[PDB]
Design a protein around this nucleic acid. Structure first.
Ligand code: MG
Ligand code: MG
Ligand code: MG
Ligand code: MG
Ligand code: MG
Ligand code: MG
Ligand code: MG
Ligand code: MG
Ligand code: MG
Ligand code: MG
Ligand code: MG
Ligand code: NA
Lengths: 158, 157, 68, 276
RNA sequence: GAGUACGACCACACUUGAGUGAAAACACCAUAUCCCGUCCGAUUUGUGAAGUUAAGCACUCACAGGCUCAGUUAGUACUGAGGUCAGUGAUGACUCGGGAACCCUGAGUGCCGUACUCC
RNA sequence: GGGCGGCAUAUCUGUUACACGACAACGCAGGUGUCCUAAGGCGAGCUCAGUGGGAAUCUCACGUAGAACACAAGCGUAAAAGCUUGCUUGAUUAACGAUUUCCAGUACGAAUCGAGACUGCGAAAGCAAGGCCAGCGAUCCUUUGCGAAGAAUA
RNA sequence: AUGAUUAGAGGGACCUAUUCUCAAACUUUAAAUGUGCAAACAAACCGUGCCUUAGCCAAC
């Protein structure tokens, strides 16, 4: 069935600055995603982090770049029971950067949400319900998808 | 010392178990007229126009209707007399009372009987008193007695 | 000194001595004062008309009786 | 630790059926159904708009304890009996369905030919006539759970009904072309959206593109012939509103009785006992 | 025999697993020039129709969990009225009446309207 | 007993309290004289506390409210009564309308249903004259506001 | 459900199924005794009877 095809729903690039450092992170993220990010609030109400949400072909291109950065360094525990996985590649300069001396190197933290088509059922306003459990992406299905993309799953514990 | 407006209403002004929620659409759609008998029952989920705790579970006559409210006359004993207290509530706290249902049914039945007798039709047969005597022809006849096993059984352990 | 503050002990006896009088019938003292004003105003107009009709009806009754 | 244990189900109170199906907003429905208690239950009508994926539903509804009473309905899937046969879920279709429902209810109530509305759609705003000569039929608008954004098609059905002779109380604030800055309406933008000029522009661009508009491109639906089609559809509606589309087996499954289910369970128990 | 829209009562309707689904719908769905709204056409708004029942949805199943109605518990527990009743007493029975609850066990697993449409 | 102590002196929840209402103790466990231009009003979006999988706060599922609603408590509330946010001042005026609570069926304090004005929000139905229910004050005296202008042979 | 509480059993603690005991300020359930209203003469019923109304309703 063509409706069981696993696709990428989003990439969630996140910078956790924990002032001008957060501004440099915001500028870098905007230059890296062609899209204005949103600052986060901690919890006491200061801005701690900067994150963005990427979709479409921009998200797929960003995933290709970040995957090349890590060179297929996806351990098994990187994957989740929701069918999602992520990885953190430090020094964004690995992906094409300009190294403006005003904003130094920065450890972007990529995260990938893999899901199947038809998930609107759980997020639409009218008639919101639950996707059937057969239609959910599993850990194994995410494994198969990744090993089809770029490979490199080596088992670990910690 | 504490005597508030809602003093001692912990269990009175509370929803029944697994029956919480805002009033229902039938309550919104019920038409209340002056002269209707209504039961005053406080809806704890509204907290507007709610009757004082005294009038919960009293039945009275509607004397006044406003766009969102109902005026009910309620009898209230005090010392040696009963007053006729006019309370103001929102419509969510009254229910169409069934206190005259049997009387209305009786009057309807009398009109129906009058019409039938005017027409010469067959009146329903009369019910008979169950208290009259007669022959009993039993199906099973058993001995009613105390046995040993009863005293043996109703002892625990 | 210290003495007894409250009791209701003999009070229902006293209240029942001359009995608990029952309520006034609903058809007595049914003043409409303070009820919903638009309906009150309309009903007043109807009542004025009904008083005029009663006066005319009595006049006609007097004339018809005098006819006999 | 477990959240969904036996006690969880024992204490659980289900929502209303239409709430857990995600159809009815019961706060809004209660406020929409409510009237002055001094009205003593005099008739009150909701104009219901529910745009599905392929269809537009418009109803004149009366709330009753036994269930809502539908007086008149009109559907955007019944529009090709009036001309327009494509784009049955756009703004022009919503407008046409609204006008059809207005004319149908006014004819069924016998007050047609006495309340005409705006014969030519100009897109301007005229305040309704309400108690709040002879007053026009009044219904209130029920959008349901739809987002009431400026330009949304639910107000397209609203506008169609208003031009059809209804008195549906509204402000022009959500009609397409309303600018929230100046607090004013551009009636020409509303006119263009009513007669489908936006669809015509997008279709012309899609033709110059050389999946979208496929049934359009399978016919010879030129962009310049849209507006006349919608005008003629308006006229055909005003002519004959009763018009519609031209015109035992069972697939139910046998549920087995409780004794048969008991026999099935006993047999499975016997089998598992023998197998071990 | 079904579907959609609006519904009334609000689990016999819920939850968890599996299975099947005619037609028409419903919905997933495709897409952003315009109205409109987003960090993100995800949601939402507009325009659409290449595909799919994979999910939602509808029906079936489970010695399923809950829920509803019965029975059992039990004339038991408790209780209105009575005694110059018993007992040192705590209490208890008796006399004229009222009369439960849980555990457990049996059955059941939505229903009634308005309009419109498909077999 | 009085004194010392305390406040049971005005007053609010829960319990005492005996399945209508009422019900005492220097009975029990606690509150009150404030605080808020938003912590008031309305519309719209959203869902909370906690869990579990995953990324050198961000994510996806579960989640009957186990959070929150200024302050003690009870009650209530999940497309909200909570959180966010947009624009607002119904926290104004309101012809001596009626009513509840206390109760003598007197005031005071708090409430409830209204009628009129002028408005806020909303597409609309609607919803608002404060923050539900504790948070307060007679006579006399002092003190402030209202009785703009312009008209009328009266 | 909220609180208090003994012990084992299965996956030092955690969980899962229960088990020893129980609450004036806990409760799903729930009596007896109670407590409002009604039980035809200023009322109610029937007629789609007439008049009236600046009331409601799009009108009737
Ligand atoms: Mg109670
Ligand atoms: Mg004394
Ligand atoms: Mg009592
Ligand atoms: Mg009592
Ligand atoms: Mg007065
Ligand atoms: Mg006062
Ligand atoms: Mg109000
Ligand atoms: Mg207020
Ligand atoms: Mg508040
Ligand atoms: Mg208030
Ligand atoms: Mg207060
Ligand atoms: Na007003």
């Amino acid at each position: 069935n063509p409706m069981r095809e696993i696709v990428v729903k989003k990439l969630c690039i996140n910078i956790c600055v924990g002032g001008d450092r957060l501004t440099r992170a915001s500028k870098v993220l905007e230059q890296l995603c062609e899209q204005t990010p949103v600052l986060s609030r901690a919890r006491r109400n200061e801005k701690i982090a900067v994150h963005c949400t990427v979709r479409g072909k921009k998200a797929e291109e960003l995933l290709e770049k970040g995957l090349k950065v890590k060179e297929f360094e996806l351990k098994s525990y990187n994957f989740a029971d929701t069918g999602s996985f992520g990885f953190g590649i430090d020094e964004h300069i690995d992906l094409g950067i300009k190294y403006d001396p005003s904003t130094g190197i920065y450890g972007m933290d990529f995260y990938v949400v893999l899901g199947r088509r038809g998930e609107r059922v759980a997020h639409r306003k009218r008639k919101c319900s639950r996707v059937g459990h057969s239609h959910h992406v599993t850990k194994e299905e995410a494994m198969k998808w990744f090993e089809k993309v770029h490979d490199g799953i080596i088992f670990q514990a910690k | 010392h504490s005597y508030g407006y809602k003093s001692g209403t912990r269990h009175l002004f509370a929803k029944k178990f697994r029956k919480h929620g805002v009033p229902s659409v039938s309550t919104i759609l019920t038409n209340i007229k002056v002269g209707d008998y209504v039961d005053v029952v406080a809806d704890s989920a509204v907290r507007e126009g709610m009757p004082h705790k005294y009038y919960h579970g009293r039945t009275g006559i509607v004397w006044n209707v406003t766009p969102r409210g109902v005026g009910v006359i309620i009898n209230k004993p005090v010392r040696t007399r009963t007053l006729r207290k006019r309370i103001c509530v929102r419509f969510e706290h009254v229910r169409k009372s069934r206190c005259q249902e049997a009387f209305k049914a009786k009057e309807h039945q009398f009109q129906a009987y009058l019409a039938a007798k005017k027409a010469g039709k067959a009146l329903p047969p009369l019910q008979k008193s169950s208290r009259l005597g007669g022959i009993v022809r039993p199906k099973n006849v058993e001995v009613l007695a105390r046995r040993v096993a009863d005293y043996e059984a109703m002892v625990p352990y | 000194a210290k003495s007894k503050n409250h009791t209701n002990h003999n009070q229902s006896s006293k209240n029942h001595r001359n009995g608990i009088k029952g309520p006034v019938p609903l058809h007595l003292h049914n003043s409409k004062r303070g009820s919903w004003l638009p309906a009150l105003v309309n009903a007043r107009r109807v009542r004025k008309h009904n008083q005029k009709a009663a006066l005319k009806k009595r006049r006609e009754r007097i004339a018809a009786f005098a006819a006999k | 630790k477990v959240v969904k244990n036996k006690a969880y189900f024992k204490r659980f109170q289900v929502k209303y059926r239409r709430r857990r199906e995600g159809k009815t907003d019961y706060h809004a429905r209660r406020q929409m159904v409510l009237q002055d208690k001094t009205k003593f239950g005099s008739p009150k009508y909701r104009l219901v708009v529910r745009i599905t994926n392929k269809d537009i539903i418009a109803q004149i509804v009366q709330a009753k304890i036994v269930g809502d009473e539908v007086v008149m309905a009109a559907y955007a899937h019944e529009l090709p009996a009036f001309g327009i046969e494509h784009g049955l879920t756009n703004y022009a279709a919503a407008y046409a369905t609204g006008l059809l429902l207005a004319r149908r209810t006014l004819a069924k109530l016998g007050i047609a030919d006495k309340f005409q509305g705006a014969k030519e759609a100009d897109g301007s705003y005229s305040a309704v006539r309400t108690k709040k000569e002879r007053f026009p039929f009044k219904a209130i608008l029920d959008v349901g759970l739809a987002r009431t954004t400026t330009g949304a098609r639910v107000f397209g059905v609203l506008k169609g009904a208003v031009d059809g002779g209804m008195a549906v109380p509204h402000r022009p604030n959500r009609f397409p072309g309303y600018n929230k800055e100046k607090s004013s309406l551009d009636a020409k933008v509303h006119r263009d959206r009513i007669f489908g000029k936006h669809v015509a522009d997008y279709l012309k661009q899609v033709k110059e593109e050389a999946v979208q508009f496929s049934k359009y491109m399978a016919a010879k639906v030129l962009p310049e012939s849209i507006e006349g089609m919608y005008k003629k559809a308006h006229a055909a509606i005003r002519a004959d509103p009763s018009k519609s589309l031209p015109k035992h087996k069972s697939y139910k499954t046998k549920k087995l009785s409780g004794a048969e289910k008991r026999a099935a369970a006993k047999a499975k128990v016997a089998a598992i006992r023998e197998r071990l």
